[model samples]
Target chain A: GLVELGEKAPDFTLPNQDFEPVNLYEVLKRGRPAVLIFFPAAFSPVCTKELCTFRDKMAQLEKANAEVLAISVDSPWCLKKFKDENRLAFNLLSDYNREVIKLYNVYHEDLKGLKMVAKRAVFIVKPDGTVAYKWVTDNPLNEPDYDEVVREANKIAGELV
Target chain B: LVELGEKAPDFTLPNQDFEPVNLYEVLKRGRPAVLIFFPAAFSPVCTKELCTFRDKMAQLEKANAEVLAISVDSPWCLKKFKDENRLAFNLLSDYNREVIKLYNVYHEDLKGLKMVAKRAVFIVKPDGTVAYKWVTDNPLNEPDYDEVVREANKIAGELV
Candidate 1:
């Protein structure tokens, strides 16, 4: 029910850990497929594991020339702390203002006192800005199919290549 | 630079330790602030500008104002620089592409490193209005240290 496959993913710009603007359209314009990852919050057990899995798979993702951007309700400072502690090499974007998640429709709520969260979701946006693949799970505790995510992301990037 | 009597724009930025440092909160502490903006951490001019402020802490403390430094560098880098220098003030990170621009101190390109904060300072009063301001078109140049302290003294003197 989220952004349907082949639909044009909305272009959004969020600040990375370094406080740099990472524009979705800009990432796509560079000829790499955008692997837009929306996670609930940073530092939770499941979220950390899922992110590390993607980090471990960066070699394959690199071969596919995919750009991974993890978005969450956490502030850029929290993302920066999480990133340095975990050695997360990808871009960890701050969606603290709750603008990007609301736009993507992955906005979740009521996770402890930290109410604002994003449903665990992944979308592969091609260089042309079309959604190549999308996956969302309602269960906050559940991790995404890491290999399947790699497969679809790779498939699309490979196609464009 | 924010002009005299202008309400300073509020921005929430991360300090060197990755803690979110909000501007208005600093003003709410009932004193003025020396909001220092610089190009990057670990650079020569940056080191001198901040260290000059560090060495002048005695003169600055009585002014009853907070000293908050800001830059476009990552918090990790800022932490290292802050620790290395043993500076007393909190160093804020403005890696935001917009805030630096909004502050009108946005340096478009500095030797190919884009969006670095231009060297500047704003003295924000308790009322959130800028009491004193200084900016350098040349990012390599430092501010007038004596003038900054004098202005700090002048503004803090206003509160009493």
Candidate 2:
């Protein structure tokens, strides 16, 4: 179940790969669409693929006036290392404490020891902080639909008409 | 927006070389596909899952299924992960912002942290129909790979 589409997207503050706090409202205030990508950890194969996908396609996202950010449960130190190693140009944020993950209902609960990790999910937030599009997987192994995202993004961008 | 049981989604993710590869094409090569979504690459639970999958590769091969592991990581990172873990499977990178959301696995935290995929697994038929699906809202939990393989084998056996 996704947060009801069109509801006010929640706001929070978390550290980026550089250890600087990134505020969601501040990002939205830029008046551009934001693509928020959440993953469980950094330096993992799947997470690497997902982020690299964004890294490879960053131009298309930017052409739509959209900014991309990747979040994970790794500490800023780990995330920093990941960005440098991969030459990632986007913002990599750390939610190692699970503050943002919990707020967005994507945080995975601890089974034995782990806590506050986000389950895989994507949310397309409009400039006004309302969710224009959202998707959640019943199976994390499956990737989300990029075509639909482009379609939705186009639709939202057209609505600005 | 995921249309369950509809035409399967398409993605161009990085293979071992950080080169873009198509998901649909892989499925067309005469094998059922298993897509495993993890929280991150080098963590404990995910490592366990990958190792388990590696150990059971024989069974999956017997069923004629190829397993793909996905995350929001980069190709370079995936290359490192493959070398470090000695993964025999094709570790795919969804760096282009498509696969995670396409599969409905993206998560949006507060303050524009963006969204990432959840931990889940799926078995896709050669025709790209989702035959088996298991998604976890928890990152710490490991999916039932045995159950997934069993389901895949049963369906693939019937279909093929």
Candidate 3:
């Protein structure tokens, strides 16, 4: 289980698709409100569709002043190709060593015989660095509710203003 | 190290591009082959070794040899690795560890990362018998490139 709403979000640094290090706190400082999406693998069908949904919904999320950061156990190189292949506009962060996944308590011990990958989850971080909303799934096949996530982002953006 | 004169273990695995490739089917094309088992995708040493092979591919082709690089990485990761490195050879995904174990090149535990394949190389004659084999315990060390190319050329010469 991840941190509950109102809990201070755990801060960590990970490499993005361009192999540039991105810090959670820094991103929150710049964007104020953000969404952290943890996924299983880069090319897995469910994850692909899930992230693509985020890509398609980028306009609404941006309108809500929420920056999307997708995290995975994939390397920076893998994330780069996944981002390019799918034309995903958001930041795809690499949790290559599984450090951030473990810190967030979203590490799935065994997924289809692959070890130490992330479970599908989402955490909305408020401007104050506290968790505004969190959703985690035991099954990786299912994605989070896009409409609900956008609604929450809009609500948080309104609150921040 | 696997033994020469033994038949190389056959396998069917997805390539970096997610296309299926079978060992026997490739051998049936009558080209001698070289198979390199690497530890991981995008790791420094593995990337250097595979890229070196890519740079020298013309020499291997002149000897009528086909090269295949194997790793436990998923096809998705391997696809990215291949593209990023600009590698022209085929990279096989042994994600299930089946082929790695079959070749006796699996490292049960390496520096705390479990079930990684060892750094190894094998030259298989067109007839399916392994003509040369090499394995290293140190992940950072590379295989003897010149020696492998020589062996591949020798085996192809014998067939000719």
Candidate 4:
């Protein structure tokens, strides 16, 4: 919910699995659009499946001229193992510090005694650093439409990038 | 089946206060315990599963069980996560690295990466024997919360 369609997504800095800093604004300067998928945590059932789906479909995403990033509140260490276990080539960034979550307004406060975690969300950012499409889920169980994401990316691939 | 009917594995890890909390000390509190293993602190299924436990805390209390969510995340990260979410349950850190291995949940490092625990849940009776266990291969899915409670309730009934 941070950046709507045609709006600029906010810049952020978060550590990857190696504990090295990753800057969103810096990545965007490389002339490629970005596809970000937000999940509540790593290694949860739906998240693992969804990420694996992305892993298997990386070529499709690449054809759209987009780089993928998975965001969660998990620490870099956990992300690292997740990447290894799943053989994910994309970056798994952590908002464990809550900096990016706050910026995106996806940080859900403790409701029903559960701790705050990011709601499941996704954004396709254009090469101009503006959001092109976004999707979010209300329940944690539902899977977002990966095909629709690719289709939208295809439509924007040449024009937006 | 390693040590299945014997003393549960003992471990020392930090609580939210960053103070060392020993498993033996925790068990001395005379309450049954539930260890909810999660892949990370704030992901979708993990949040929903944990909140489900919190929402049903009264039921757990009726069965005299205390719930703890465990992850390999550092204590500082856990603290921030717990504070932000207002999770009332205890979030324990396993940075010291004994219990995870003992539980067979520790993932071995491959290709130069440090190890982490696999997502698995365990319930221990006050006497320290394993009461129930569920280890998941899927990271995005959650354990059946209702089934877990039902198991705990059955064990509690037998113990009483």
- Best candidate (score: TM-score): 3
> What is the lDDT for A60 in model 3?
78
Q: After superposition, how far is residue A75 of candidate 2 from its true place, in Å?
A: 0.3
Task: Report the lDDT tens digits of candidate 3 across residue range A58-82.
Answer: 7778788877899997656557778
lDDT of 2 by residue, A1-161 (tens): 34668997887678877779888879878776777788766666566777777677655665666667778766565587788777998898887556777777776664112344577778888878888777765444556666566556756655765
Shift in Å, residue A150, candidate 1: 1.0
Chain B TM-score (model 4 vs. true structure): 0.76
- State, as a TM-score between 0 and 1, how close model 2 is to the true structure: 0.49
Model 3 segments more than 4 A misplaced: B1-33, B37-67, B79-90, B94-120, B124-150, B156-160
Q: All models: lDDT?
A: 0.74, 0.68, 0.79, 0.69
Can you write out model 4's per-residue Cα lDDT over B66-116, one digit (the tens) per residue? 677777675655775666556776778665445677777755642222345
lDDT of 4: 0.69
Per-residue C-alpha lDDT of model 2 across residues B6-123, encoded as one tens digit per residue: 5668777777575666888988887678888765554435454353322232233334577788876555556666765566678886644468888887665423335555677778
Q: Residues A15-129, candidate 4, lDDT per residue (tens digit)?
A: 7876777888688777777778888766666778888888887677778776788898776766776788789989989775566777877665742223557777788887677
Model 1 Cα lDDT, one tens digit per residue, A25-141:
988888888887888766666888999898898777777777888888655655776777679889998775668778888766644323446889888888888887778777788
Candidates 3 and 4, the one with greater TM-score: 3
Query: Residues B80-137, candidate 1, lDDT per residue (tens digit)?
Result: 5666567767887665545688788977776445566888888988889988888887
Fnat for each model: 0.00, 0.03, 0.17, 0.13
